[PDB]
Structure formats: structure tokens, C-alpha cells
Design a binder for this molecule. Structure first.
Ligand SMILES: CC(C)(C)[C@@H]1NC(=O)O[C@@H]2CCC[C@H]2OC/C=C/C(F)(F)c2nc3ccccc3nc2O[C@@H]2C[C@@H](C(=O)N[C@]3(C(=O)NS(=O)(=O)C4(C)CC4)C[C@H]3C(F)F)N(C2)C1=O
Ligand SMILES: [Cl-]
Ligand SMILES: [Zn+2]
Length: 202
């Protein structure tokens, strides 16, 4: 048994900033501080205006990224779980959930801009981190890519759910996991956009 009247509810995922890719310089912007993030997580009511393709998102215990592609805000299950996302009208229930792909999605917030899925078949990719670093990544397989310049894993922590982009700025995949050998990240594993398009058309 358990005392049901006091069972708590997990809060919503909350947008706390964005990666500005609009102009000629990539940079992170914060749109909500720690206090407002916790209040907004509990209510699920986020009145802030949303802009751009890559959002910085937070729960009470984790922070990561979320990327809009074809009208869906995508992120990783290991960050969001089954949580709703805060919105101007209250919590919004997930529209996609696939733990086997480490993938979840909500309807893209009003004001967001969506990336278009890549059709160019290029293997010269670019990973966008939560610090607005644009890291060249050579595609090595359907879901893997190697860093031209390896980095300590610390530099990629908190960027799951961010995009991998082709040279034309099209979405190639969603950053999922890192290939980590003794604290150094040599390569990345991502959800291919085609897997997204299947999840959408499924
Ligand atoms: C050693 C390592 C780097 C920690 C780990 N490597 C690793 O496992 O490599 C193997 C070998 C090649 C691919 C991968 O096969 C296993 C697949 C794992 C997975 F990803 F599909 C995954 N599915 C889940 C589904 C349901 C519930 C939990 C799940 N947990 C998973 O993996 C976990 C999570 C994932 C992670 O940390 N991702 C990143 C991130 O930033 N997160 S985060 O924002 O800070 C944060 C924790 C707030 C959300 C991008 C990498 C950054 F840190 F660089 N992990 C562990 C790793 O990357
Ligand atoms: Cl996949
Ligand atoms: Zn492309």
C-alpha cells in the first residue's frame, strides 16, 4: 500500500533558453532563471514567447536541448521521460514517445521555427551544443559520427536533444549519446531524421 493523497506529480519540461542561429553568429540566450523555471515546471503554464529552432530545456533535476523539426519539438527520452511540456495554456502531453529510440516529441510551440529534414545525403555534419558551439562531425554510419576534434565529455554534457545539421542547415539527426573513452568524446550517436520521419508517418 501507499498513502495516495500525498503522492507527488512530476513537473513539466520547461523551455529556459534557446540557441540563436538566426544571424551570422551562434550564441545561447537564457529566457528564464532558476526560480521561474521551477514555478513554471509545477504549473505547466509558460507565458514566455518562444523563438528559434533549438530550445534549451530543463526539468527540476536535468537540463538538455530540444529541436523543432517539421512542426514537432523533439528531445531525448532520457531527459524528458514521459513529462508534459509547459505552454501558455498549461501542460502539453507528448505527441510521440519511443523509449527504444530514446525519443520523445511535443507539438512545436507557437513562435518556434522548424528545421527541414535533410535530403542532400551529405556526410559533413555540424553538431550544435547547448553552449552554441558548432562542432564539425563526419558521418560514419546511419546513426554515428566522429568529431574532427575530440573533446572532454564535459563539453557535450547537456546537449542531448540538440541537432546535427548538414552544410545547408537541414536537420540530419538528434544528438542522443556520446562515444566516450576515458572521459574523451571521440564520436556521437544520434537519432537519424529518417527515424523521426518514420515515427511521424507511423
Ligand atoms: C557514457 C555516456 C556518454 C554518458 C553515454 N554513452 C553511451 O551510452 O554510448 C553508447 C555507445 C554508443 C551509443 C550508446 O549506446 C547506448 C545508448 C544510450 C542512449 F543514449 F540511447 C540512452 N537511451 C535511454 C533510454 C531510456 C532511458 C535512459 C536512456 N539513457 C541513454 O544513454 C544515457 C544518456 C546518454 C547521454 O548522456 N547523452 C548525452 C547528453 O548530453 N545527455 S544530458 O543532456 O547531459 C542528460 C543526462 C540530461 C539528459 C549526449 C551525451 C553527452 F553527454 F555527450 N548517455 C547515457 C551517453 O551518452
Ligand atoms: Cl533510432
Ligand atoms: Zn541537407
Amino acid at each position: 500500500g501507499s498513502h495516495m493523497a500525498s503522492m507527488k506529480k512530476k513537473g513539466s519540461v520547461v523551455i529556459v533558453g534557446r540557441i540563436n542561429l538566426s544571424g551570422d553568429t551562434a550564441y545561447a540566450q537564457q529566457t528564464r532563471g532558476e526560480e521561474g523555471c521551477q514555478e513554471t515546471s509545477q504549473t505547466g503554464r509558460d507565458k514566455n514567447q518562444v523563438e528559434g529552432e533549438v530550445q534549451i530545456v530543463s526539468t527540476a533535476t536535468q537540463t538538455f536541448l530540444a529541436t523543432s523539426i517539421n512542426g514537432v519539438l523533439w528531445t531525448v527520452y532520457h531527459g524528458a521521460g514521459t513529462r508534459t511540456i509547459a505552454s501558455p495554456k498549461g501542460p502539453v502531453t507528448q505527441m510521440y514517445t519511443n523509449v527504444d529510440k530514446d525519443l520523445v516529441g511535443w507539438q512545436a510551440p507557437q513562435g518556434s521555427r522548424s528545421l527541414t529534414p535533410c535530403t542532400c545525403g551529405s556526410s559533413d555534419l555540424y553538431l550544435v551544443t547547448r553552449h552554441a558551439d558548432v562542432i564539425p562531425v563526419r558521418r560514419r554510419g546511419d546513426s554515428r559520427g566522429s568529431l574532427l576534434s575530440p573533446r572532454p565529455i564535459s563539453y557535450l554534457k547537456g546537449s542531448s536533444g540538440g541537432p546535427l545539421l548538414c552544410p545547408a542547415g537541414h536537420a540530419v539527426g538528434i544528438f542522443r549519446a556520446a562515444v566516450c573513452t576515458r572521459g574523451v568524446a571521440k564520436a556521437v550517436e544520434f537519432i537519424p531524421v529518417e527515424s523521426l520521419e518514420t515515427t511521424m508517418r507511423a
